[PDB]
Amino acid sequence: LTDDGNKWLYKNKDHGMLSAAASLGMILLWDVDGGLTQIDKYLYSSEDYIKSGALLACGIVNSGVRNECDPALALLSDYVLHNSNTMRLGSIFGLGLAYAGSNREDVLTLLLPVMGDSKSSMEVAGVTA
Amino acid sequence: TTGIATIEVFLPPRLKKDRKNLLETRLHITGRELRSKIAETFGLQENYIKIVINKKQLQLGKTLEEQGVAHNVKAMVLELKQSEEDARKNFQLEE
């Protein structure tokens, strides 16, 4: 998943891409630098649908740890409002993993509009709650 | 004071130095100058470092006084194998 990943994922149809991309972040947990730098070859994929995939990887890497620079909110926030339903699935879910139990008012507040965003699909909602 | 503050930035592990190598510089020159000055002072590439600043990200199209970055604005300098924009190309290849 670190050398020929573009080749590997390309043989996964949509949701397959989502899963494979997310594992990129879980392959490197507890490294907001190494993983985040191991987070620099896919997410912006020609099938940008996999963006949720690295977003889970983006959120997953921050799960179980807290960095003073608050990376999870920064990267994810710009795409939690992304119109594409799949793009958002990774955003909210990955964000939840990163700050699980943090109870941070900001992220909790930012997650607030996601609940009320009617345009969000139900699958976006279920992960959102 | 005097319209200036100290930026408590964070660098990555692989670039072996004081793990949190601060990034001291002015705040008036543009973000294009930011990666220029976020790289010039403490020995980084103008095009090999992104600065996720105060729970935000550098908008190097804007100056440090306008791009959301500012004085005192702490950042994790991810070891972006390419620039901030080039890891907005590299880190953004997967971002």
Taken in order A99, A95, B77, A79, the sign of the CA dihedral is negative
Q: Within a 10 A sphere around the Cβ of A119, how many other Cβ atoms?
A: 9
Minimum Cα–Cα distance from A52: chain B residue: B95
Query: What is the structure's resolution, reported in angstroms to one decimal?
Result: 3.5
**Strands of chain B, DSSP E:** 52-53, 75-76
List the structure tokens of B80.
């972006």
Size of interface A-B (CB pairs under 8 A): 84
According to the entry, how was the structure determined? Answer: cryo-EM
Q: How far is B32 from chain A (nearest CA, A)?
A: 20
Name which of B38, B76, B90, B86 is nearest A61 in CA terms. B76
CA B2/CA A115 separation, integer angstroms: 43
Chain A residues with at least one Cβ partner in B under 8 Å: 21, 24, 31-34, 36-44, 54, 57-58, 67-71, 73-75, 106
Contact B12 A37 (CB under 8 A): yes
Taken in order B73, B78, B79, B80, the sign of the CA dihedral is negative
- Indicate the residue type of B81: K
